[model samples]
Target: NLYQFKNMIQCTVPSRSWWDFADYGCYCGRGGSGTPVDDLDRCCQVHDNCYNEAEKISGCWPYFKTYSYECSQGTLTCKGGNNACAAAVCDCDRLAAICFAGAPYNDNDYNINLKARC
Candidate 1:
């Protein structure tokens, strides 16, 4: 059985056009090393401004991820593995409903598997 819940928070990457005027083709607070003073200044300014706006609307940091739920068999699990600023949940019952709903058979309903990030 496999079940997926909607992500609570989502982040948007800045437009690529913004980097055209920057020192290098970088954004998201990343200014390549040894960047020119003028370029670095502009890069940082754009990076900060974009993230500030992103946070105001998303209620999360620039690159943050939100809570997600998954289920398998009769067991349920919730995790935030993609969230760098938050911890993942190991135990959750909310995920069970979706898991059981998708179960293939009643006998093999106890096995639950969660994906691991490589």
Candidate 2:
């Protein structure tokens, strides 16, 4: 069942335009709760003027309408804790790619097996 869930997460990637925008993107506060909270706060505090919608969480995650598609997979599992940031990134992939601060992530081939279950 774990494998099925993992595969399901990866399958939703292409719908997100992950190839074009993530080339050099750096989302500061996408899900907000991590060791880098200081970094995000510092950056946001310093910039106070620059605009980037992806860097703001408001309070909880915005409604799925905000993004091109919704990640129903992790919505109930990891969307609340400190791990939510990583979960959001993985949910964007067609497959799960570990996104913890120091964990390794395979930016490429994430969508390769997205449809295996379908």
Candidate 3:
């Protein structure tokens, strides 16, 4: 017998409005790590900014959000589904991912080391 906690396979990526006022950088979410150490981090910052701006698109993403949303059925219609706002959001994520992967993010953005700061 296979027992599961939630039968709803809905994975939602919600956006927030605070992202517009936050100085957060690099990481995505309502906020981010702290300051961007290099151009690599700047890439993420740009993406965050993109999302913040997208927040005004009515049906677009915001501070508490993500690019793609998927479930057992398939991808959500809000993500790149004839939606301009979603398109921008998706682009933001794509750019951020590409930027992060394009370089060596040797910073404490995620590690938060005790000896070093990023």
Query: Which number leads on TM-score?
Result: 3
What lDDT tens digits, residue by residue, belong to model 3 across residues 18-52? 22212323443344555665665576567668777
Give the per-residue lDDT digits (tens) of candidate 2, residues 54-106.
23644423222121223464432333343443344324332222122112233
- Candidate 1 lDDT over residue span 16-103, tens digit each: 2322222322221243322323333333344445444444543454343344554444334556564522222112113222322232
lDDT of each: 0.30, 0.30, 0.45
Provide TM-scores for the models. Answer: 0.24, 0.17, 0.50
Which of the predicted structures, 1 or 2, would earn the higher TM-score when compared with the native?
1
The 10 consecutive residues of candidate 2 with the worst lDDT sum are: 94-103
Off by more than 4 A, model 1: 1-36, 66-118
- In candidate 2 the C-alpha lDDT for residue 65 amounts to 16
Give the winner by lDDT. 3
All models, RMSD in angstroms:
19.7, 15.5, 10.3
